[PDB]
């Protein structure tokens, strides 16, 4: 559950990285002198690698979603266990109130 | 979710059953004392 969702979070961050690499590449090209042309090539390869693996991750996840889609609303649930747990907790609360009352009558008896 | 709620239910029921047994022993002592009181 955290796996595919964390993949989606990573692809969010890498879309940001793609835009920042676009911006950094045209930043270096706008310079009056741009000595680090090797670093320009590195930023260009970084940009294209970012776009390519963003495409790879999203295509893979659309494929995986195509494999496990059904168009049906999933008739499973967990309601009955929550109901039984609520009844158990209210049993405990009822016993707590009754124990408070018995202890209060014991304090009234011992108090005199 | 189901397994977690089942474990909570079982803990509550074990607490209640042990409470009932201890209260029952106290009730036995109190019944003996009250019914055998001279007054």
């Amino acid at each position: 559950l955290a796996n595919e969702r964390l993949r989606a979070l990573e692809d969010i961050e890498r879309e940001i990285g793609a835009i920042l690499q676009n911006a950094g590449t045209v930043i270096l090209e706008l310079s009056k002198e741009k000595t680090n042309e090797r670093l320009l090539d590195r930023q260009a390869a970084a940009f294209t690698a970012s776009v390519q693996h963003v495409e790879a991750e999203l295509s893979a996840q659309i494929r995986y979603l195509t494999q496990v889609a059904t168009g049906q609303p999933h008739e499973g649930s967990s309601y009955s266990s929550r109901k039984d747990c609520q009844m158990a907790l209210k049993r405990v609360d009822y016993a707590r109130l009754k124990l408070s009352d018995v202890a209060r009558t014991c304090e009234q008896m011992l108090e005199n | 979710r189901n397994q977690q709620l089942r474990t909570l239910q079982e803990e509550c029921d074990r607490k209640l059953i042990t409470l009932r047994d201890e209260i029952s022993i106290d009730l036995y002592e109190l019944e003996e004392e009250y019914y055998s009181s001279s007054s």
Binding site: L89, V92, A95, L99, A103, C106, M109 | -
Partner: peptide, 27 residues
């Protein structure tokens, strides 16, 4: 002696009740 015995029984019972309230509060 009946009075003192009744008070001893109720004191033991009251301590057990307070212990069980402290147990049942912690669920």
């Amino acid at each position: 002696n009946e009075l003192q015995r009744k008070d001893a029984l109720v004191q033991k019972h009251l301590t057990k009740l307070r212990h069980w309230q402290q147990v049942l509060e912690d669920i």
